[PDB]
């Protein structure tokens, strides 16, 4: 079985490169962050622009939804994160304390906590209600490229240019595991599988790997794409067939079979590096976004 993703919409309106796109957990919305210091909200199913959210003093590298789809968090080069009410567009909180560009962010499932990773080689855990920083993990010896909570929020996975993935106990901040592999290539992205048993990690040697968290063993490898310079988002697609979805520096969206590792589709149409992909929580829908020479988001639909 192979998917047949086809272009449904292109979304234009960011004035610089787009950095991240995410579907709202309720499937209604796509949120995009960009170098032009803006977040934009679009309808997931019709591509209609809904609103712009602004207030960061520099560009935004990541954005994430709360579980109830009511809040957003953004990570910015102005060294802060911001918590936003989506319906009103107002900034509810500004999370300060990182000493460098903030690069990645995510809510936990309960959405009382936010995790962030920064160029200051640190991971921080923040309280949503008060905006205070609860914990600072001396997580890495290089910039932190990704942070992600597991299914129930008891664990944090982080990745860094230092070549390490680290599993942390959220409650204690103690490191439970470190994944190392061979020649220590920079790790550009990491995230838990939906079941929380596996970890998908991108390295800047044109490689994706599926690791079993419990065993510390790499189970699958995915290649054929170009990934050497940027921290590209990758995804588990679970609404139809079980795919791995990633962007690529050859302007293509790559889709692999999870079990067999064969490339099952390449989505063509972007005119720059595809920095971010996102998979719709209930429909076979992919959102992709590209850098300076493109500046657009594309929505793709498939039957499986």
């Amino acid at each position: 079985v192979k998917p047949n993703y086809a272009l449904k919409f292109t979304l234009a309106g960011h004035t610089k490169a787009v950095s991240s796109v995410k579907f709202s957990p309720n499937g209604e919305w796509l949120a995009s962050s960009s170098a032009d210091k803006l977040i934009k909200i679009w309808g997931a199913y019709d591509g209609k622009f809904e609103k712009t959210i602004s207030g960061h003093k520099l560009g935004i590298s990541d954005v994430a939804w709360s579980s109830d789809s009511n809040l957003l968090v953004s990570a910015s080069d102005d060294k802060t994160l911001k918590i936003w009410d989506v319906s009103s567009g107002k900034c509810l909180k500004t999370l300060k304390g990182h000493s460098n560009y903030v690069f990645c962010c995510n809510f936990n499932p309960q959405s009382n906590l936010i995790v962030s990773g920064s160029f200051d080689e640190s991971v921080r855990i923040w309280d949503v209600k008060t905006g205070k920083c609860l914990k600072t993990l001396p997580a890495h010896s290089d910039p932190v490229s990704a942070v992600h909570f597991n299914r129930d929020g008891s664990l944090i996975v982080s990745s860094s240019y230092d070549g390490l993935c680290r599993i942390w106990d959220t409650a204690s901040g103690q490191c439970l595991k470190t994944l190392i592999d061979d020649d220590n290539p920079p790790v550009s992205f990491v995230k838990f599988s939906p079941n929380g048993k596996y970890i998908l990690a991108a390295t800047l040697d044109n490689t994706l790997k599926l690791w079993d968290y419990s065993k510390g063993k790499c189970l699958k490898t995915y290649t054929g794409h170009k990934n050497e310079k940027y921290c590209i988002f990758a995804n588990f697609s679970v609404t139809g067939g079980k795919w791995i979805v990633s962007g690529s520096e050859d302007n293509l969206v790559y889709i692999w079979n999870l079990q067999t590792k064969e490339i099952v589709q390449k989505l063509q149409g972007h005119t720059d590096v595809v920095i971010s992909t996102a998979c719709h929580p209930t429909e076979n829908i992919i959102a992709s976004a590209a850098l300076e020479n493109d500046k657009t988001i594309k929505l793709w639909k498939s039957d499986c």
Binding site: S19, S20, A35, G59, D62, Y101, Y161, Y230, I275, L291
Partner: peptide, 6 residues
């Protein structure tokens, strides 16, 4: 700056 190469 995710939009800039390393």
């Amino acid at each position: 700056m995710r939009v800039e190469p390393r």
